[PDB]
From a paper:
[name] is a hepatocyte-specific [name] dependent enzyme, belonging to the Fold Type I family, catalysing the transamination reaction between L-alanine and glyoxylate to produce glycine and pyruvate, thus leading to the removal of glyoxylate. [name] normally localises in the peroxisomes and failure of its detoxification role leads to increased levels of oxalate, coming from oxidation of glyoxylate, causing calcium oxalate precipitation in the kidney and urinary tract. Many pathogenic variants of [name] cause PH1 (primary hyperoxaluria type I), a rare autosomal recessive disorder. Our results shows that two forces generated by the salt bridge between the conserved aspartate residue and the pyridine N1 atom, and by the Schiff base linkage act as opposite springs and are responsible for the fine tilting adjustments of the pyridine plane of [name].
The tetragonal crystal diffracted to 2.5 Å resolution (space group P41212; cell dimensions: a, b, c = 90.7, 90.7, 141.2), while the orthorhombic crystal yielded a high-resolution (1.7 Å) dataset. In particular, only for this high-resolution dataset, no density for the Schiff base linkage between C4′ of [name] and the Nε of Lys-209 was observed and the best ligand to fit the density was 4′-deoxypyridoxine-5′-phosphate ([name]), which is a [name] lacking the aldehyde oxygen on C4′. On the other hand, it is known that radiation damage might reduce the Schiff base linkage and significantly alter the internal aldimine geometry in a [name] dependent enzyme, especially if the initial geometry is distorted. Therefore, a complete X-ray photoreduction of the Schiff base was hypothesized, to relax the geometrical strain of the internal aldimine. A continuous electron density between C4′ and Nε, relative to the Schiff base linkage, was observed only when the model was refined against the early dataset, while no density at all was present in the maps of the late dataset, indicating that the reduction was induced by radiation damage. Consequently, when the Schiff bond is broken, the C4′-Nε distance increases from 1.5 Å, observed in the early structure, to 3.0 Å in the late one, the optimal distance for the 1,3-protortropic shift to occur. In particular the photo-reduced structure (late) shows that, once the Schiff base is reduced, the interaction with Asp-183 alone tilts the cofactor and brings it in a productive distance (about 3 Å) for the subsequent 1,3-prototropic shift to take place.
Residue numbers in the entry:
A (entry chain A): 6 to 390
B (entry chain B): 6 to 391
Amino acid sequence: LLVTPPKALLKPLSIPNQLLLGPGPSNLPPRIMAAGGLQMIGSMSKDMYQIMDEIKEGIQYVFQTRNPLTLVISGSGHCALEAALVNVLEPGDSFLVGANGIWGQRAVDIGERIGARVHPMTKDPGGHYTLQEVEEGLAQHKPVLLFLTHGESSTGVLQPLDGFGELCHRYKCLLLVDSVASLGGTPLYMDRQGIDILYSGSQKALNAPPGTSLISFSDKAKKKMYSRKTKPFSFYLDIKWLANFWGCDDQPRMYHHTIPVISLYSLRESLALIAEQGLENSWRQHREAAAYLHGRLQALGLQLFVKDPALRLPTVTTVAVPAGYDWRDIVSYVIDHFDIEIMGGLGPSTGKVLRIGLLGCNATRENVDRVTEALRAALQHCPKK
Amino acid sequence: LLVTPPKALLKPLSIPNQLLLGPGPSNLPPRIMAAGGLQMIGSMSKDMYQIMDEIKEGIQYVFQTRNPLTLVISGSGHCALEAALVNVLEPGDSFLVGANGIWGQRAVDIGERIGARVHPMTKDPGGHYTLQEVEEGLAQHKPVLLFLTHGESSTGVLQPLDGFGELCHRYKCLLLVDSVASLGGTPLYMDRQGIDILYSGSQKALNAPPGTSLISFSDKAKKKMYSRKTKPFSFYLDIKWLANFWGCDDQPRMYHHTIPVISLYSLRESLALIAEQGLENSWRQHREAAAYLHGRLQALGLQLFVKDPALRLPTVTTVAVPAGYDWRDIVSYVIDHFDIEIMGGLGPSTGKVLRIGLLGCNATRENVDRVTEALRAALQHCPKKK
Ligand SMILES: Cc1ncc(COP(=O)(O)O)c(C)c1O
Ligand SMILES: Cc1ncc(COP(=O)(O)O)c(C)c1O
């Protein structure tokens, strides 16, 4: 044979112990690890459908929606975003985007690829959108769809959502919201806030492993996706097929693709955990953990990148890189000496920030203390121009 | 709150003990279960990249390729097929498809959606392509890409592959092969056989959980994907981005999407297990387990759907549904009474066949015997038309 068994593969798997305090993925609690170690069941068995149905109820709970077109996307946060866009948007459709961070920039990229006429509302990192600004975009561009990031994990921003749905609906625009970083960490009410498409991911405050994502569509969104003149560019993400297999339509489930059974166990357990805790209690925990972190970072002489506390995303905090340091030095020091992962910036915030995540079971004052101690040490050991 | 905590989630997760002898997914051996129970590491950590590098080596081993553009797709087998098509095919490209089962039909569907000029070579379930049939399509349709299913798990057919890559190259056509159901279970040699795009899935003979897939691209395929004057319709599956993050190009790894860290542990362990067994040993195991199943099925009075033994896929065996039975009765009998899963047909083979899988750790004499006794029972106790 051309290729021999890889020597490295003949060694056993060995992973380091890391406290993951960046913007995700987050460490896994015991129940979620335990679920990940379970045996397979048939991907189209009655028992699998029951688990799926329970996951659906769980998503409806954490999104606060009664939308029946609610399901799991078999891919990461990006894949749920792509699923929303390739299904809602048809070539030529006007697409208004909140490009105030990497996530709006990604929505622009996807939208251009699938033929939308994309209209970015570009805002410096750290900014958020007002009702006035969005209405100017609706006036100008008459979009079929608005994208807004709820939790801007690249900039640390918590985007207000009240009023945007009603505004979009007046202009016959659908409202698409990214809650990958905000879900479970901060108030969110899909139906009350008139959101038409809402997606999140498994690996942020839910503390499930990365690889799945959560999505829900309103009746107005469904009407668009189900009256397209062309098929979506994606078969894997075609919502008509996915809606059927997830039991969201009035037909028996037909095979589309094999769902990630073991990941669905773990997701089920992550939704059970937050259902046990209670949404509002989870919001409380994150709010207070972030407030504690903010004060500890400030005591170090560090400056929070988002100055208005009301606009700070509890789950991902941005810290202005301290003058004189190489942020890469700080990030490396924190993992190398304290086995804690934090991150620098991303997209427009690249080079400008450090990012510290407080996600679910890892949103604790203990972890705030750990990362604060590690940052303190990095500031006095990392070289300062 | 509009929605209160679902009471069903407040109960513990419980799963039944099922022997999965369908065409996939397969049961997990203990080492793969154990990998899936591990703690997280950073998704862009040095240690993660090492694990990715080892998985890449494991893919190059099981595919038998030295292609540097080899990586995991963060999606099921369908996602790897879509990744191949959306990156290789530009709107208007001629696309020749071996449409001899559901997998060719799905390639047609994707090709149509992404604006290719699709030319199906249609065949009835059980059919396979000869070199002369493919050359007639290559001459008539001038394709930039041919899709062939290697292991046609919906029909039980093993498509010969020798010489198809060379033939395609003579017509300046890329060869894309689906080996989701064949990999590990039957001979396959990506570079030797001139295959330009090869993909497989995690949940068949590798016995990993479903949801990841394996893909490799030749330099000829890479040239086409990196030479197009349109961006692919997908960001999530854009090969330029994926190649970078998987360490296949000249640039620092950039964040694209978060890879499924835990699934990569388990996929890594699955590649380690087959690297421990040895490809050829795995081929022998499957060949012998299937030969045994074929004998035991025929001794029951059942007819194998693929009449030419050389065309029989070891990993997935199609059986004619016996006259007078509702195949649904047989399949439900077997899971309801024995906790054994088998399947009916799929796409064109629906209603025509039962499908029995022998995949990796499940490809054993003991499991052939269990399914044989289950079918014996089902034949004795399922209603037969008057
Ligand atoms: C707000 C936000 N949106 C989208 C994503 C993308 O998720 P993924 O990395 O899982 O594709 C992330 C990581 C995120 O924080
Ligand atoms: C040959 C073959 N191709 C493709 C698929 C689809 O794979 P998945 O369900 O993982 O998307 C299967 C199941 C298969 O046996």
